[PDB]
Chain length 268, copies 4
């Protein structure tokens, strides 16, 4: 029963009950899929959040920057799901970029060390995580990551935009690799979703002469979207993810599926 | 059980059991959706082909060039689906181009009358159907067409390629009109499927020359595709359509989904 | 002396002293190129306008819909420039779309006969004109036409948008043909330029509930353009055209060169 | 006489007389522009190569990874060009990637440190230069980088491909900052030019395998290109750059111009 029924899927990126990856896992569980979650430093905290999901799932630690963690993932996962078992899905919902390369800080003022860190976590980790779990996946599986259309320049997104441009390109390579094991790799470009990381800027954390820019940006989205767009509700994005983790899109790979309500296909 | 369980969907484009619509209709029904099929002219002859379907679905006549037909369309679907009842999806699997604008004929040598009719049936009927059927579709329902990625020139496809460009363009506007009803409009860029009216080409009826040209595009498609491409299995495509018909991609319109084995994302 | 010095170029589309093609020809002449202009019905009128250019150029008649005119062009041109002479450039600045398929009239209400007419003149004529003049061009030559980015749907442009989508695709085919004679074919996407055809709507010819839409559309352009954008000045577009007709872009073909001040590369 | 007559332009990226920058510098000078060249480390060794240039142009040292250099850049160009005098254009012909992220090494097998440096030198230095040189450039002046179309995965190019994606993305933002000065920022997607550090590859130093892989991409490029492609003539490219440096494309920024013989616009 369910869309992902019987599939064992790895979800990551969770940190709050408001982050997209949390809703993905919740929908994946509601669709009878069995999970394995990976989290960052505040494991003690992430533990609490996951203790809200409709069902229990082992929670492993995963700093994408720790090449040592990566060297143990496949094993640990093998423990989580059990011998004689393989993964059918891998979801990469991880992003990082110092405020030096996003918010209000000028584009030319982000030092490389900060940018390189963001790209390492936002772009590179997609390839290495795919390098870690590829070997324990069943042919016919789906790896999928989050994206935010970097097609055209926009205010404040600055370097996180460059990282995303570099994520799509990497996604196309991971796919010719993944395709060897019969696995599909795709990205999902979502519109903006009022998550916690931004839940603070909502009141003016970045100020007026900027906190207004991002604002007119989001409104433009529902404005442009033929079917509208509520940014305070991730579900539409999560269902799209689930669709990609299922078996009803087994001919699409190395692609980008836009879950933005058609905004990117309309100018005004 | 079923991905489209309880969805009343219209499928057009069927002529032979080889045609893609037949496989879209098939997978659609194995997943519990109620259908309505439309045929062009040799009506009494396609019943023999839709009689080889899982379930019995009424067949209405629909010649997209005939304005009379279009106008009577909606009333005719009701007479079939049920008073007050609506459609959840409509599939446009209609493509036509005189050999004078496709195959072996030179590009500059196609009369405009032949091109006009190829576009009229290939691009414009998409806006026509949607115009007729929009008023009797459910919110959250969806429309979907068949595409063949024309982002690049290629031998033989010629004016059909230009017809598809317009389709992608026409699709973006249909979504805008479809939004005022909460309906989705998307296209599926299929890979090359050896259909009846296509397997002959390689058979030699195109000549030595062109018969080798076409083979190169195919043989080189499965080569580009990371998870390969079986040119004679419309299932991966039919399954992608059904997916776009479900509620699992509720946030994407005026867009193109590639069920081409990832072959458009690789240069080699 | 000049950029196009010595080149014999064919310019078309002129109708007023405000239309883009007029400014193209003016800049082409200012750059020491010798012209041949083709015009539509009001030849008596177009005559006056051209009698403003910095120099005299024969003015031939050319209805792109008259297959008979097309069958005589190469000859007539041969007369204009003289035996032993060939064309080095061809500029297609021609566009048409009934008000039934552009302005305020809904997208679903444009009948095919009107659309087909627009596409015939906006899309198809590019191929047939290239079919007419290709044979009298010198290898190393450039054919170029006007475009308005049809990448994403927009209000009011409706069917003229579909025609343009179909122009870019045709441009890619004309190029593999043109490439046989060593000729390059490219399109130039310009931002909006307050020409006469729209000089009327400026005051409210289309009304408020629409004449305001197109307005916020144009302002968005200068807003988005990193280098600004004055719509009441064609020159920037004309210089771009000249650049394409010269010999400093002999490796680019079947392309689209955007002369919009970078607006299409910026979201907000 | 000259397309860039009276334009003071900076050209970087020269190491051998084979390198593309040398040909960009050459054609630039034959067209009357005054130049400033920057070299990386074996300085005293490239003077021998820039001494084979039409005219004597000062050479400054510029290691894009060195912050000290960057900071002293602008002051150093003045010491060369003249007090109160400015630059009209800046050419970025800089690309680098450890063999561990390009050629024969597997894709998942490239350490991040090697990728970080390839991006730092391939993508980020573009924003760096522009940041240093922007304050001393003339309005209407322009900046231009070298690109290699990464819209699709391909064998061997691997992480250099991901580095170029970021370049195209970085370029869109540079134009936004460059607009506040009336400067243009564009990239030239060159076709494959057999450079010194590239002709060896086919020579066998890549091995039998990869040495055939690379050949296929090349041999199949001139095949796709409608006006063909001479992989060992950087002139068509150099001439496209100079064009982007002139005032004949004053309305295009944050964009990519393909001097690839039209090879990206054909599927076969
Ligand atoms: N907010 C939007 O509208 C939107 C739209 C499209 C895509 N995305 C992308 O989706 C992803 C997650 O979005 P989110 O909105 O749920 O934000 P989020 O802040 O809630 O989650 C991002 C997560 O990144 C993980 N992370 C950070 N550094 C890490 C590291 N070194 N190692 C391992 N994990 C690390 C954390 O567990 C963190 O909570 C990101 O990649 C993001 O850019 C967001
Ligand atoms: N075969 C492939 O490899 C492939 C690839 C990409 C896209 N497509 C697209 O898929 C769809 C179906 O392709 P197909 O290969 O199965 O071919 P098909 O010939 O079986 O189906 C096209 C159908 O068009 C319908 N049709 C023709 N003229 C019509 C009219 N006036 N009014 C109403 N209907 C009319 C017919 O019933 C016809 O059989 C088309 O839209 C086509 O361009 C096919
Ligand atoms: N206005 C803009 O902002 C803009 C931007 C980009 C591209 N364009 C395109 O540039 C071209 C011309 O633009 P314009 O602004 O100078 O407008 P324009 O109205 O001044 O010129 C278009 C011309 O089309 C020609 N024409 C029409 N029907 C014809 C036919 N049957 N046969 C031969 N010629 C015919 C006429 O001589 C006419 O004046 C069109 O193709 C247009 O869509 C316009
Ligand atoms: N050769 C081709 O076919 C081709 C195709 C498309 C794009 N390109 C691009 O064209 C440009 C030049 O290519 P090329 O083939 O002539 O190779 P090239 O090796 O001759 O030039 C690249 C140059 O990078 C410079 N460089 C390296 N590290 C540096 C540093 N730290 N600081 C400053 N400068 C540094 C050097 O002076 C070096 O010679 C690059 O940006 C490249 O990616 C080349
Ligand atoms: O991808 C993300 C996103 C979400 C959570 C994250 N946690 C760590 C990095 C990170 C990035 N976002 C954030 C929200 N939007 C807004 C936005 C919408 C429209 C236009 C511009 C911007 C914009 C610009 C800067 C920061 C945030 C945003 C973009 C996507
Ligand atoms: O869109 C169609 C298609 C489907 C049904 C049709 N009924 C009338 C015209 C028509 C075209 N096709 C058919 C099969 N392919 C092949 C093909 C694959 C790769 C490269 C070239 C071609 C190609 C060229 C000519 C005719 C058919 C095809 C393209 C999609
Ligand atoms: O390509 C043209 C154009 C110019 C002159 C013409 N003569 C005959 C056809 C024709 C088309 N235009 C006209 C001006 N704009 C405006 C515009 C700008 C931004 C957004 C929407 C629109 C828009 C919509 C409808 C009509 C005109 C326009 C688009 C380009
Ligand atoms: O961008 C570059 C380029 C230029 C200078 C450089 N210095 C250090 C790395 C580097 C890369 N190139 C080099 C030549 N080609 C070839 C090529 C053409 C088609 C397909 C694949 C490849 C390919 C693959 C690996 C190395 C070089 C190349 C790509 C552009």
């Amino acid at each position: 029963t369910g869309l992902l029924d019987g599939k064992r899927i790895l979800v990551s990126g969770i940190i709050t009950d408001s982050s997209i990856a949390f809703h993905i896992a919740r929908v994946a569980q509601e669709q009878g899929a069995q999970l394995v979650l990976t989290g960052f430093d505040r494991l003690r905290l992430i533990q609490r959040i996951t203790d809200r999901l409709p069902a229990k799932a082992p929670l492993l630690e995963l700093d994408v920057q720790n090449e040592e963690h990566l060297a143990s993932l496949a094993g640990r996962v093998t423990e989580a799901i059990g011998a004689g078992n393989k993964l059918d899905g891998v979801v990469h919902s991880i992003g990082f970029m110092p405020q030096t390369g996003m918010g209000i800080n000028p584009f030319f003022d982000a030092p490389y060390a900060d940018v390189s860190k963001g790209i390492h976590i936002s772009a590179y980790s997609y390839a290495s995580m795919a390098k870690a779990l590829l070997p324990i996946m069943n042919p016919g599986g789906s790896i999928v990551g989050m994206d935010f259309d970097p097609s055209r320049a926009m205010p404040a997104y600055n370097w996180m935009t460059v990282a995303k441009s570099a994520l799509e390109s990497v996604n196309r390579f991971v796919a010719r690799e993944a395709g060897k094991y019969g696995v599909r790799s795709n990205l999902v470009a979502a519109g903006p979703i009022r998550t916690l990381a931004m839940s603070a800027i909502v009141g003016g954390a970045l100020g007026e002469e900027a906190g207004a820019q991002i604002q007119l940006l989001e409104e433009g989205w529902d404005q442009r979207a033929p079917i509208g767009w509520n940014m305070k509700d991730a579900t539409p994005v999560a269902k799209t993810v689930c669709a990609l983790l299922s078996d009803w899109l087994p001919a699409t790979t190395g692609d980008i599926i836009y879950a933005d309500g058609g905004a990117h296909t309309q100018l005004l």
